[PDB]
Every structure is written in structure tokens, then in C-alpha cells.
């Protein structure tokens, strides 16, 4: 845990683009360590109340260590900018992989779900609840293992509703179960190629989520449908435990990874 400066890193190609900031491949000069460096201008941040939100997000991230959670090594700032030192994921985002492939097979989906659940169980133990997870925020390691990247929204709406649970959008207070819903949405999107509540309109998506209106294409197997339906209950209480998800026969049948 030391203070870092831009002089310390050689900066490479951009890994990703974002309005808040851009992510660059970087190499630490002393160790030749390869990593992603995330650059945020203070001003863009200050304009919105993120400045407190970013500091808590950084605080939460630094402490967490899991195979399926993207590591944050450190942070530093320059007169006009904030820089996040992040683990680098060679195989990139699941999002890019999904739009390259268009859908995932059950074996790849089940494996991703299992890794997600494991990562989620670990977060809950630390009293960290995630709330926002989407293929854009999922990264792949050299082994091809899923990693949870952001945490920029972590706790113990003008933005997209696609992955938000009914309780959060309706203004009801929310608990861990919120993550179980996220798992159900992701599992659907992996298999089908689109999130279950996708719509032309924020207002339209609101209603679909609120009513929990989703249908399955023919190719989705009964095993998957059962898992999704359990995950996607309107009442958080009905939603299964992570352990229950890990033990689901469909997960068990098709997963590479352990519970
Ligand atoms: N460590 C990283 N390795 C690879 N791509 C990353 C990394 N951090 C962020 N990104 C990319 O930048 C985007 C913005 O966070 C991500 O969705 C992803 O595409």
C-alpha cells in the first residue's frame, strides 16, 4: 500500500471507453507488472455525487479478494484526474463475447452462473451487496474464468432498468436477494442473447419488470427455465439461496466449476 503516480506506469492501448473515463492497458515500470489503469477526471465526477460514491466503491473493492472478483490494486490522483489501478483481464468482457457469439451454450452459461454465485456468496459474507451486474461489467481471465469488475454501486433512477430487480425500481427497500434476481437475468441473457425484460422504452421495461413479464424461446431447456423462474420471482423471499442455485441439477449437469 503505497502512493502511486502516473510516472510509475507506461500506458498502452485503451481497453475500454466510458463517459466517466477510459480504461488503458498499462505496465508498472519497476516490476514490469501488467494491469489495467482506469482514468477518471475529477470534474466529471464532482458534477454528480459520485465523488463520495467512488471513494466507498474503492474502499470496498480493495479489501475483497476472490478468484471471480476483479482485483483493485490501488488508487491515486493528479491535479485534474483520478486513476484506478486494476487487474487486467486478457479475454475481455462477457459482453463482447456475447455479441460475438450471440448466445452461450448451457455448459458455458452454467459455468458462468456458478462462478458468479461463488463470487456473490463471498460478497455477502463480507456484508457487501452488489445490486448492478451486467455483461459489460463481467471480465474474463486468461483461463476464461468470469470476474466481477465494477462495484461502483456497492452497499451493505436515470440509467437502464434491464438488470434491476422489481424492489429497487419500485422504491421498496432491498436485501441480498436483489443479487439473486441479477443471477436470473444474466442466466436468461446468456442463453437467449438478450435480457428477459428488454424493451424499446424505459417505461415499457419498468412495467415488464414490475409484472415480471418474460417468455422463453423454444430452444431454452426445461432445466434452465426452472432455474430462471425460481430466480425471477417478484417477491425477494421466494428467490432461492445461492447454495440452492449451486445445487440446482441444471447447474450440476452442465457446470465445469464447483459450488
Ligand atoms: N481490467 C480490465 N481489463 C480489461 N478490460 C477492462 C478492464 N477494466 C475495464 N475494462 C473495460 O472497460 C469497460 C469500462 O469499465 C469495461 O466494460 C471493459 O470493457
| SS (HEC) of the chain | CCCCCHHHEEEEEEEEECCCEEEEEEEECCCCCEEEEEEEEHHHHHHCCHHHHHHHHHHHHHHCCCCCECCEEEEEEECCEEEEEECCCCCEEHHHHHHHHCCCCHHHHHHHHHHHHHHHHHHHHCCCECCCCCHHHEEECCCCCEEECCCCCCECCCCCCCCCCHHHHCCCCCCCHHHHHHHHHHHHHHHHCCCCCCCCCHHHHHHHHHHCCCCCCCCCCHHHHHHHHHHCCCCHHHCCCHHHHHCCHHHHHHCCCCC
Within a domain: residue 138? yes
Domain count within the chain: 2
Beta carbon of 85 within 6 Å of any ligand 1 atom: no
Report the CATH number that the domain containing residue 61 is assigned in CATH: 3.30.200.20
Quote the cell numbers at residue 71. 482485483
- How far apart CA 103 and CA 214 sit, in angstroms, is 18
Q: Is 137 annotated as a binding residue?
A: yes
Beta bridge partners of 78: 81
Q: Clarify whether residues 19 and 147 are in a common domain.
A: no
Burial of 228 (0-12, 13-18, 19+ CB in 10 A): buried
Q: Which three cell numbers stand for residue 107?
A: 455448459
217 close to ligand 1 (CB < 6 Angstrom): no
Q: Do 5 and 102 belong to one domain?
A: no
Contact (CB, 8 A) for 123 and 131 = no
Q: How is residue 114 written as a grid cell?
A: 456458478
- Determine if ligand 1 sits within 6 Å of the CB of residue 87: yes
- 103: its cell numbers: 448466445
Q: Which of 105, 132, 162, 175 is catalytic?
A: 132
For 11-20, letters b (16+ CB in 10 Å) and e give: eeeebbeeee
Q: Please check whether residues 160 and 238 belong to one and the same domain.
A: yes
Name the residue with the closest Cα to ligand 1, atom 6: 15
Residue 164: closest CA among 136, 184, 140: 184
- Which residues pair with residue 22 across a beta bridge? 17, 39
Residues 107 and 215 in one domain: yes
Nearest Cα neighbor of 86 from 18, 147, 30, 136 is 147
Are residues 36 and 87 in contact, defined by beta-carbon separation less than 8 angstroms?
yes
CA–CA dist 214, 106 (Å, integer): 19
- Judgement on whether residues 79 and 176 belong to the same structural domain of the protein: no
C-alpha to C-alpha distance for 94 and 100, rounded to whole angstroms: 10
Q: Residues with Cβ < 8 Å from 85, sequence gap 6 or more?
A: 4, 35, 37, 38, 72, 73, 74, 75, 76
d(CA 206, CA 162): 9
Same domain, 102 and 225: yes
Report how far ligand 1's centroid is from the alpha carbon of 240 (Å): 30
Which atom of ligand 1 lies at the shortest distance from residue 70's CA?
Answer: 1
Q: Are strands 21-28 and 9-17 parallel, antiparallel or unpaired?
A: antiparallel
Name the experiment that determined this structure.
X-ray
Backbone angles phi, psi at 13, to 5 degrees: -65, 150
Residue nearest atom 17 of ligand 1, based on CA coordinates: 136
Distance (angstroms) between ligand 1 centre and the Cα of 53 equals: 19
User: How deeply is 153 buried, as exposed, middle or buried, from its count of CB atoms within 10 A (0-12, 13-18, 19+)?
Assistant: middle
> For the packed helices 106-125 and 222-231, what is the interaxial angle rounded to 10 degrees?
20
Query: Could you confirm whether 132 is annotated as catalytic?
Result: yes
CB atoms within 10 A of CB 129: 18
Q: Is 88 in the pocket of ligand 1 (CB under 6 A)?
A: yes
Query: What is the atom index within ligand 1 of the atom nearest the CA of 136?
Result: 17
- On whether residue 259 sits in a domain, the answer given is no
Q: What is the residue range of 196's domain?
A: 93-254
Amino acid at each position: 500500500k503505497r502512493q502511486w503516480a502516473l510516472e510509475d506506469f507506461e500506458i498502452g492501448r485503451p481497453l475500454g471507453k466510458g463517459k466517466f473515463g477510459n480504461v488503458y492497458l498499462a505496465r508498472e515500470k519497476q516490476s514490469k507488472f501488467i494491469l489495467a489503469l482506469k482514468v477518471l477526471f475529477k470534474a466529471q465526477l464532482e458534477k454528480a455525487g459520485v465523488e463520495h460514491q467512488l471513494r466507498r466503491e474503492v474502499e470496498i473493492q480493495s479489501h475483497l479478494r476472490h478468484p471471480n472478483i476483479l482485483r483493485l490494486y490501488g488508487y491515486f490522483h493528479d491535479a485534474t484526474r483520478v486513476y484506478l489501478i486494476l487487474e487486467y483481464a486478457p479475454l475481455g468482457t462477457v459482453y463482447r463475447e456475447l455479441q460475438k457469439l450471440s448466445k452461450f451454450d448451457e455448459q458455458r452459461t452454467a459455468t458462468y452462473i456458478t462462478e458468479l454465485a461463488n463470487a456473490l456468496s463471498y460478497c455477502h459474507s463480507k456484508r457487501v451487496i452488489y445490486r448492478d451486474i451486467k455483461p459489460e461489467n463481467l471480465l474474463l481471465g486468461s483461463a476464461g474464468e468470469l470476474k466481477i469488475a465494477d462495484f461502483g454501486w456497492s452497499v451493505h433512477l436515470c440509467g437502464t432498468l434491464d438488470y434491476l430487480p422489481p424492489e429497487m425500481i419500485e422504491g421498496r427497500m432491498h436485501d441480498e436477494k436483489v443479487d439473486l434476481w441479477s443471477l436470473g437475468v444474466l442466466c436468461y441473457e446468456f442463453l437467449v442473447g438478450k435480457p428477459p425484460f428488454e424493451a424499446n422504452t424505459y417505461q415499457e421495461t419498468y412495467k415488464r419488470i414490475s409484472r415480471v413479464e418474460f417468455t422463453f424461446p423454444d430452444f431454452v431447456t426445461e432445466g434452465a427455465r426452472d432455474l430462471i423462474s425460481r430466480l425471477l420471482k417478484h417477491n425477494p423471499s421466494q428467490r432461492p439461496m445461492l447454495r440452492e442455485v449451486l445445487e440446482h441439477p441444471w447447474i450440476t449437469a452442465n457446470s465445469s466449476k464447483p459450488s
